[PDB]
Amino acid sequence: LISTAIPFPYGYIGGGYYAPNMITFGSAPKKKLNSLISSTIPFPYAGY
C-alpha cells in the first residue's frame, strides 16, 4: 500500500487533468502529395 500510495501528481502545466494537445508527424512523399497522411500522437503524454 505504501508503494502504491503515490502522492497525487499535479496536472498539465497550463492547468488541467483532462487531455493532451496532440501533434502530427511523418509523411508519404508522393500524383498524390500525401502531406496529411501521417501519424498523430498526444503531445505531452506525461504532462502530469
Binding site: 493532451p20 496532440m22 498524390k32 502529395l33 500525401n34 496529411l36 498523430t40 498526444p42
Partner: protein, 421 residues
Amino acid sequence: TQRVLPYSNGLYVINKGDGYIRTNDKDLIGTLLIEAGSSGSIIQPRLRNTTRPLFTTSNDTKFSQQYTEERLKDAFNVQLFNTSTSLFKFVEEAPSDKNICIKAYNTYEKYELIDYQNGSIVNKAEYYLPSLGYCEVTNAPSPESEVVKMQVAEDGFIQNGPEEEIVVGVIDPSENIQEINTAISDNYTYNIPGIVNNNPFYILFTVNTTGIYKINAQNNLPSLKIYEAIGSGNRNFQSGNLCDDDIKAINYITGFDSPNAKSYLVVLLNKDKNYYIRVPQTSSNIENQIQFKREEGDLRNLMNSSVNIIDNLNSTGAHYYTRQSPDVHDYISYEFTIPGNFNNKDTSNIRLYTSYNQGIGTLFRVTETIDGYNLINIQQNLHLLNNTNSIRLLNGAIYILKVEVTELNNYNIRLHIDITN
C-alpha cells in the same frame, strides 16, 4: 416466403456487419470544406478512452446489457465495450479544379443475440459496438441550390459497410458443465452424476486418438447434441488429458433437441479439439450413462449424423417421422426394422420419401455380426423428395437410411416409410 434457419435450439450471436450510423446526423463528427488543391483530415486522436455503445432488447430480464456483453465476450471474445484506443483518420485531397466536402460519421458494428427455439426467435437483442468511422466525400454544393424543408426521419440505423452475417453459437451460461479430465481412447462409460440431478447440461471432453466415435445414452435415451469448441486445441495441449480453454463459442455438429428421442451419434472427433455434449432435461430419476465407443467397422459409414432408432414400425401401412432438419450437405440417419418375422424369404414392398426437403439417401442392410454391426450398401442416389419408386425388403431385417439434405425447404424433415404386403 422467408428463408429457413437450420439452427439447433440454443443461444446464437450474429455479427450483422460494420459501418452502421444513426439517422438525422446523430453520429456526425463533422464536415470539412477543402478548397481546390488543398487537403483535409479529420482525426480521432483517442485522447479519451470513452466510447458509447448502443443496446436494445426484446426481453430485459434475461437478455440484459450485462448478459448480452458476456455473450458477445463468449462468442467473439470482445472485451472493450465502453473504451477503445484505436485511432482512425480520414484524409481527402480536393482536385485542382473544384472544391470537395468530406463528412465523418461515428460507426457501429451490429451484433444480434438470439434465443433460437424450434424454428423461431423467442428473444432478440441488438448490441451496437462503436466502430472506426465512415467517411463520405461529395462535390461542394452550389451555395444556394435550394434549401428544401424536410421532416426528420425515424430513429434507426443505416449500414454503409459491406454485407455480413456471421453466426456463432454460445454455451448457455445457466447450464452446468462437467469435465472428463482424461481423454477417451477407445471405450468409455461416463456415469451421469447425481450432482446435476436430471437438469440439461454440458460435458466437456477430448479424444485420445482421432477417429469416428459412437456416443449414446442408455437405451439411446435421451437424445444428445454434440458441439465442437471453436478454436480449441490451438494453444495449450496436454497429451492424454483435457485442457479446458473455457471456450464458450460452440459449433453444432449434430443432435436432436427432442429428449424423447431414440438416437445415437456417429461423429468424427479429433484428438486436438475439445468437444461439448449437451444432454437435455431428463424426466426420470433412473441412473443414466454416456457411452463412447471408437467405431472401427461399418458404423464409420454414418459420419456425421444422429441415427434414429425406430420402434413403432410394427404394422403395415403409412408411417412418418418428423425430426429437426439438418442443414444442406449435413446428414441424418434412421435405423429401422421391417415388421414381421424374419425367415429370409418373406418380403415387403417399402416406399421411402420425404415431404418438403429434398435429399440424397443411401440404404444399408444391417447384419449384426460378432464384431459389431455390418452395413451393406444396397441403394444409392435416392432422391427422396416425393419419391414414388419402391424397393422390396426382407421382413424382420434391420436397415439404416442415411439422408444428406440437398434442398432446405422446411425446418423439419418428415421421413415417410410406407409398407405394403
